[PDB]
A paper describes a structure:
To understand the assembly of [name], we performed single particle cryo-EM analyses of the in vitro reconstituted complex. We noticed severe particle preferential orientation, which we improved by using fluorinated octyl maltoside for grid preparation and that allowed us to achieve an overall resolution of 4.5 Å. Subsequent image processing and focused masking of the top and bottom portions of the map improved the quality of these regions and allowed generation of a final composite map with local resolutions of 4.02 Å and 4.52 Å respectively. We could rigid-body fit two copies of C1orf109-[name] facing each other in a diamond-shaped arrangement sitting on the top of the [name] composite map, with both [name] molecules directed towards the [name] pore. We next focused our attention on six unassigned densities located in the top region of the [name] map, four adopting a vertical orientation surrounding the C1orf109-[name] dimers and two positioned horizontally underneath C1orf109 alpha 1 (α1), α2 and α3 helices. The overall map resolution in these regions was sufficient to discriminate between the [name] and [name] N-terminal domains (NTDs) and permitted positioning of four [name] NTD models in the densities surrounding the C1orf109-[name] protomers and of two [name] NTDs underneath each C1orf109 molecule. Guided by partially visible linker loops connecting the [name]-[name] NTDs to their corresponding [name] units, we fitted four and two copies of the [name] and [name] [name] domains in the bottom part of the cryo-EM density. The structural model suggests a 4:2:2:2 stoichiometry for the [name], [name], C1orf109 and [name] subunits, forming a full [name] complex with an architecture not previously observed for other heterohexameric ATPases. Mapping of the cross-link sites in our cryo-EM model indicated that C1orf109-[name] association with the [name]-[name] heterohexamer predominantly occurs via the N-terminal and [name] 1 domains of [name], and it is further stabilized by secondary structural elements in [name], [name] and C1orf109 as well as via direct contacts between [name] K196 and [name] S88.
We show that [name] and [name] associate in a DNA-binding heterohexameric complex together with heterodimeric alpha-helical proteins C1orf109 and [name]. This chromatin-associated complex, which we name [name], uses [name] activity to process replisome substrates in S-phase, facilitating their proteolytic turnover from chromatin to ensure DNA replication and mitotic fidelity. [name] and [name] belong to the CDC48 family of type II AAA+ ATPases, which contain two [name] domains separated by an intervening sequence and an N-terminal region that typically is used to specify protein-protein interactions. We propose that [name] acts as an unfoldase, thereby remodeling protein complexes and facilitating their subsequent cleavage by cysteine proteases and removal from chromatin.
Numbering used by the authors:
A (entry chain M): 349 to 874
B (entry chain P): 201 to 449, 454 to 602, 616 to 746
C (entry chain L): 710 to 892
């Protein structure tokens, strides 16, 4: 009753698993044509509710052959033998049903690590599972019996499973995206009477940050119930015979049901191509040029310049005073060259999560590699790259998490078409140990903005703020030197505030506004 | 074949052969050969295949029973199944080489604090092996991943003690095994297998197998015309490698470096020549000279001189077997294993008995003693096991078999380390490594610049005059960045480089090598003696 | 504790100590470290107490800066006889030289006199290191030479410096004069 279309988006991995499952069954002769073992154990992983079970049931529809859903904890009965022998019966039927496929849900419950599994029944049944799997290799069984799987957490798995012939195809499925958000919205609302419009749905999806499939199902259902509630609150003597059809969902339903939603968006990994651009803040052309060189050339130019191949470095640290729109520039380059941006800010990392910090680091790096043409990032990494030793209560974790970070990055060759950008404003703070060359070498200083950047940003503001023409930009230029982009836009904000505070219905930022703004502001350049 | 395994293959060949390749009545002459070995490491690479192959090379029954396929639901049936297999092994000993191969003993061995029946299982198989000791040709090979995963009670002398690791995924073996795998696969002809190899750091063989697998998989998927002969292109290979999971994880630097990549402090060079390599000629030198060899030397210089380079150049200029000891290699998440890998590398030194062992940046290897008074106990445990094991001594008294490894360390915070390390008898020599003088700066600039595109305008001596308080890496990065400026800015596609860019780059890299820090370093670690 | 137990068990025996000042850094300096130190010293006194039980079971110790100890060991009865080890005289230096030459093939340009002259303010083992380094220098002259040249010896003498100033001997003899019993 759930075709593949019904599955919320992610069509890519859908087609992937589609062929990867059907064609083995169809012609094992194609695998054997190129001397290939028939892949036995597939496994998907991602945060819960994402579609694990939905994918399960939908393929169970689309198959055309046998499927035997086996929910995980249901087999957990402390009576020995029952679990393993029940599996045995499953596999015997699997044999008789030769063209088929077996799936296991919440497999993490079955395979907790010996450090996690405080029961050894787990270990022995894992053993029996391994026996089973390897036993599937019967030549008559080949190409006909096949294995599926999905977890809540691939980390909570066991090493004994991804071994060859047992589990190789580890497909990732997680947080959807903008187009995917809109897609899953449309798919959900496929069969609901709604008072929604196109652009309304667009902006609504835009307001969605972290939601998941079944979560959005909850959302739209609660909006519908809010609409029904409004209807029956207009007149309370209406049985459902006169209400089951008229009720439809406007935006207000969505907002109301939305503000009471925590869409499991507390700690995720967003592949979020931002909206920033060079045009957003220009100038400093030489800096962006040298940077795009250091990041992009090592694939093209030092290739054509291996001639004098001194070294194409990888780790860049291009930083000057604070507040000079740095991270803005980071995102800017990242989106302009066309790479999938990531981010790990030092402060947002300032957590007591022993290992789990490094865990997030490793997972982020792995996602990066998975989207390999891309740019990892760090902001104010000196937050946990503090001067070593001075913090005995917070740096003791810092040294070891930095060492782990090393352990990952130190794939200078794993860093092929993958760069790194930490951030700070005090070069003395940085540790030259992390600069013993090989990993993080090239350095730029991003100095204070200039008159050119000043008039640039002011043009931007007057393009974004209705201003009086009598305030010539050159006056500011004559008095805005030794300022900063952040400080300057604050200046413009304050001038606007003055304009609205004198007259609450004004429409032109006059000279006195900028004057008293200057009086209220200053080049805080200590 | 045994791709990328033949060296461990032949070592284990001789080891397990000793009781089997040669008869028993000599053992009956009052000798009890060890029986029962351990193959620890990621399997599928050939561990099974290699034990097969060696039982072949000698001629033996490949009884490749999978012990994980013997789990039982009720206590007692398991023991009878083990009776079956071990008794068949006993009749094999009655006939010839009973090369019983039993894999995954650790799953048959959940360590202490676990349930009861593990006790019955382990004690019963112990009865089996201790009884079959009487029989003539009984040998077993427990095949697992990590020895720590096994039963402790199964690591005694006269028990599973002869343990060897699976092949570490070396470059050479990496290439060997890639070729061995594809020896039955229709990969494309043109293959820069070395490139893919060096991409595949830490990837064990089986990983490489799987990688090639999915590579050819997508090859067959996104191609349909030549249904039988695939030109499995290196592009799909690359993209698959990209897709694949990173590796799960004593790495000797294969990179050789001579005395040319390094200049300055040639005094310290001759010192290292004095107290390290002349010992090679030693078996006759001290004879006509007297003086013994100093056990341990400690070279200290300011962090930034890349002393590691000098150590590796030394290891180059001697041909002696070399292994490195680093904290990043050391700081694994297993507490109590640091001492273990220490012992392991020292045992390897004993193995390749002419051995030079390097202890880099030991302040990182051994942190502070009593700065953080809540998590610094296992560090003192490593301290103790070190102070113990560091006692490599021999007869060395007035022909000679020079079976004596040497240990050399270097760091940047000796005032942090435990003072007992410097014991006369453990570390009986310490040497200073000042940052280069004007002349050393000049020379190291010259030699670091001998491959960058030089222009006819530069004058290295001026930089030398002004590039004071510059580490080696300082000058190297400096000439690097200046080359970059020149090339990009003027010659987007350039030929030459100007010194002006070095002058400008001066401030770009702030040299914080304050002479007061130099004096502090020197006074501290000269009174460190 | 087990040390003293075995000592008793093998009664005709001699306990030895060295570098007593190590454990004898006074408490209060290191708040969490000198605790085991004072516990150990207290138990040491507690062991030695069996002086009668120590039926002719002598205790020999030696250190460098005897002041740094607690007088709980230098209180009368337990450790009272004291001796400063005098620096080696000329004859002792020559004997050191004999014991050195008896293990290395040396040349004939040797001259014990000015060697002993330019080896004052040094310690014996240091002078052993001096002749050792001179042998190293001759080895630098040729990897297969035979006899070390005393010019290279003088070179080594120049290289080696006495890191022990006479002020240390002044302090030694002052303490000697201003202490308890010697015999």
């Amino acid at each position: 009753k759930v075709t593949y279309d019904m599955i919320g988006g992610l069509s890519s991995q859908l087609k992937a698993i589609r062929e990867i499952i059907e064609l083995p069954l169809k012609q094992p002769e194609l695998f054997k044509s190129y001397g290939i073992p028939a892949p036995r154990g597939v496994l998907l992983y991602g945060p819960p509710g994402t579609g694990k079970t939905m994918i399960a049931r939908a393929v169970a529809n689309e198959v055309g052959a046998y499927v035997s859903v086996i929910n995980g904890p249901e087999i957990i009965s402390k009576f020995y033998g029952e679990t393993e022998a029940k599996l045995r019966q499953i596999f015997a039927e699997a044999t008789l049903r030769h063209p088929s496929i077996i799936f296991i849900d919440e497999l993490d419950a079955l395979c907790p690590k010996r450090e996690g599994a405080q029961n050894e029944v787990e270990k022995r049944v894992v053993a029996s599972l391994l026996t089973l799997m390897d036993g599937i290799g019967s030549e008559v069984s080949e190409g006909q019996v096949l294995v599926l799987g999905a977890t809540n957490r691939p980390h909570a798995l066991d090493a004994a499973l991804r071994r060859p012939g047992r589990f190789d195809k580890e497909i990732e499925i997680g947080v959807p995206n903008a187009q995917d958000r809109l897609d899953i919205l449309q798919k959900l609302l496929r069969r609901v009477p709604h008072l929604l419009t196109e652009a309304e749905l667009l902006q609504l999806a835009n307001s969605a940050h972290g939601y998941v499939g079944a979560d959005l199902k909850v959302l739209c259902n609660e909006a519908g119930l809010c609409a029904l509630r409004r209807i029956l609150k207009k007149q309370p003597n209406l049985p459902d015979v006169k209400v089951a059809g008229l009720v439809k969902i406007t935006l207000k339903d969505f907002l109301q049901a939305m503000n009471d939603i925590r869409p499991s968006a507390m700690r995720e990994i967003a592949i979020d191509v931002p909206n920033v651009s060079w045009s957003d803040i220009g100038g400093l052309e030489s800096i962006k040029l040298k940077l795009e060189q250091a990041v992009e050339w090592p694939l093209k130019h030092p290739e054509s310049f291996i001639r004098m191949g001194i070294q194409p470095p990888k780790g860049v640290l291009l930083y000057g005073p604070p507040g000079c729109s740095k991270t803005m520039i980071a995102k800017a380059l990242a989106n302009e060259s066309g790479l999938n941006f990531l981010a790990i800010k030092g402060p947002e990392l300032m957590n007591k999560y022993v290992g789990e910090s490094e865990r997030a680091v490793r997972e982020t790096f792995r996602k990066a590699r998975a989207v390999a043409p891309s740019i990892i990032f760090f902001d104010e990494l000196d937050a946990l790259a503090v001067e070593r030793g001075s913090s005995l209560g917070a740096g003791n974790v810092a040294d070891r998490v930095l060492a782990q970070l090393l352990t990952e990055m130190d794939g200078i060759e794993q860093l092929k078409d993958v760069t790194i950008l930490a951030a700070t404003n005090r070069p003395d703070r940085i540790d030259k140990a992390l600069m013993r060359p090989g990993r993080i070498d090239r350095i730029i200083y991003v100095p204070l903005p200039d008159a050119a950047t000043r008039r640039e940003i002011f043009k931007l503001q007057f393009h974004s703020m209705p201003v009086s023409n009598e305030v010539d930009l050159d006056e500011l230029i004559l008095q805005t030197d030794a300022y900063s982009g952040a400080e300057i836009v604050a200046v413009c904000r304050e001038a606007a505030l003055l304009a609205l505070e004198e007259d609450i219905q004004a429409n032109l930022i006059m000279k006195r506004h900028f004057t008293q703004a200057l009086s209220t502001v200053t080049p805080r350049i200590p | 074949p045994l791709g990328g395994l033949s060296e461990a293959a032949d070592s284990l060949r001789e080891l397990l052969r000793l009781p089997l390749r040669y008869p028993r009545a000599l053992t009956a002459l009052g000798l009890a050969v060890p029986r029962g070995v351990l193959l620890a490491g990621p399997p599928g690479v050939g561990k099974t295949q290699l034990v097969r192959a060696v039982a072949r090379e000698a001629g033996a029954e490949l009884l490749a029973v999978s012990a994980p396929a013997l789990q039982g639901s009720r206590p007692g049936e398991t023991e009878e199944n083990v009776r079956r297999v071990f008794q068949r092994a006993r009749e094999l000993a009655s006939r010839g080489p009973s090369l019983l191969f039993l894999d995954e003993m650790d799953a048959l061995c959940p360590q202490r604090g676990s349930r009861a029946p593990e006790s019955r299982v382990v004690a019963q198989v112990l009865t089996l092996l201790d009884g079959a000791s009487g029989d003539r040709e009984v040998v077993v090979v427990g095949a697992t991943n990590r020895p720590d995963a096994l039963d402790p009670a199964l690591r005694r002398p006269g028990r599973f003690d002869r343990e060897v690791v699976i092949g570490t995924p070396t470059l050479k073996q990496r290439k060997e095994i890639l070729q061995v795998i594809t020896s039955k696969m229709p990969i494309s002809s043109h293959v820069d297998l070395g490139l893919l190899a060096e991409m595949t750091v830490g990837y064990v063989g089986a990983d490489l197998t799987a990688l090639c697998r999915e590579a050819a998989m997508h090859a067959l998927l996104h191609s349909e015309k030549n249904q039988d002969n695939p030109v499995i292109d290196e592009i799909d290979f690359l993209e698959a490698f990209k897709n694949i999971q990173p590796s799960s994880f004593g790495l000797m630097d294969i990179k050789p470096v001579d005395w040319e990549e390094i200049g300055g402090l040639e005094d310290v060079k001759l010192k290292l020549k004095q107290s390290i390599e002349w010992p090679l000629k030693f078996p006759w030198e001290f004879v006509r000279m007297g003086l013994t060899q100093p056990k341990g030397v400690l070279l200290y210089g300011p962090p930034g001189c890349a002393k590691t380079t000098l150590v590796r150049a030394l290891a180059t200029s001697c041909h002696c077997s070399f292994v490195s000891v680093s904290g990043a290699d050391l700081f694994s998440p297993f507490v109590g294993d640091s001492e273990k890998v220490l012992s392991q590398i020292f045992r390897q030194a004993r193995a390749s008995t002419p051995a030079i062992l390097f202890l880099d940046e030991i302040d990182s290897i051994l942190g502070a003693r009593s700065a953080s008074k809540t998590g610094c106990d296992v560090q003192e445990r490593v301290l103790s096991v070190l102070l113990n094991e560091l006692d490599g001594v021999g007869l060395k008294t007035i022909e000679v078999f020079n079976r004596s490894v040497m240990i050399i360390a270097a760091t940047n915070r000796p005032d942090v380390l435990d003072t007992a390390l410097l014991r006369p008898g453990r570390l009986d020599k310490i040497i200073y490594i000042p940052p280069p003088d004007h002349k050393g700066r000049l020379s190291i600039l010259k030699v670091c610049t001998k491959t960058m595109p030089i222009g006819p305008d530069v004058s290295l001596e001026n930089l030398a005059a002004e590039t004071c308080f510059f580490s080696g890496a300082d000058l190297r990065n400096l000439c690097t960045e200046a080359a970059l400026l020149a090339l990009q800015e003027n010659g987007l596609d350039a030929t030459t480089v100007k010194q002006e860019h070095f002058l400008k780059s001066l401030k770009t890299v702030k040299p914080s090598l304050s002479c007061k820090d130099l004096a502090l370093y020197e006074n501290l670690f000269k009174k460190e003696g | 504790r087990e040390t003293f137990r075995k000592a008793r068990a093998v009664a005709p025996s001699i306990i030895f100590f060295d570098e007593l000042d190590a454990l004898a850094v006074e408490r209060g300096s290191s708040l969490g470290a000198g605790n085991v130190a004072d516990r150990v010293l207290a138990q040491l006194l507690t062991e030695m107490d069996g002086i009668e039980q120590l039926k002719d079971v002598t205790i020999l110790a030696a250190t460098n800066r005897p002041d740094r100890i607690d007088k709980a060991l230098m209180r009368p009865g337990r450790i009272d006889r004291i001796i400063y080890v005098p620096l080696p005289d000329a004859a002792t230096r020559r004997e050191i030289f004999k014991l050195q030459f008896h293990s290395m093939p040396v040349s004939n340009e040797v001259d014990l006199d000015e060697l002993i002259l330019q080896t004052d303010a040094y310690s014996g083992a240091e002078i052993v290191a001096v002749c050792r380094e001179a042998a190293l220098l001759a080895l630098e002259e040729d990897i297969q030479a035979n006899l070390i040249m005393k010019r290279h010896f003088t070179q080594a003498l120049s290289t080696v410096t006495p890191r022990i100033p006479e002020s240390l001997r002044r302090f030694y003899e002052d303490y000697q004069e201003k202490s308890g019993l010697h015999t």
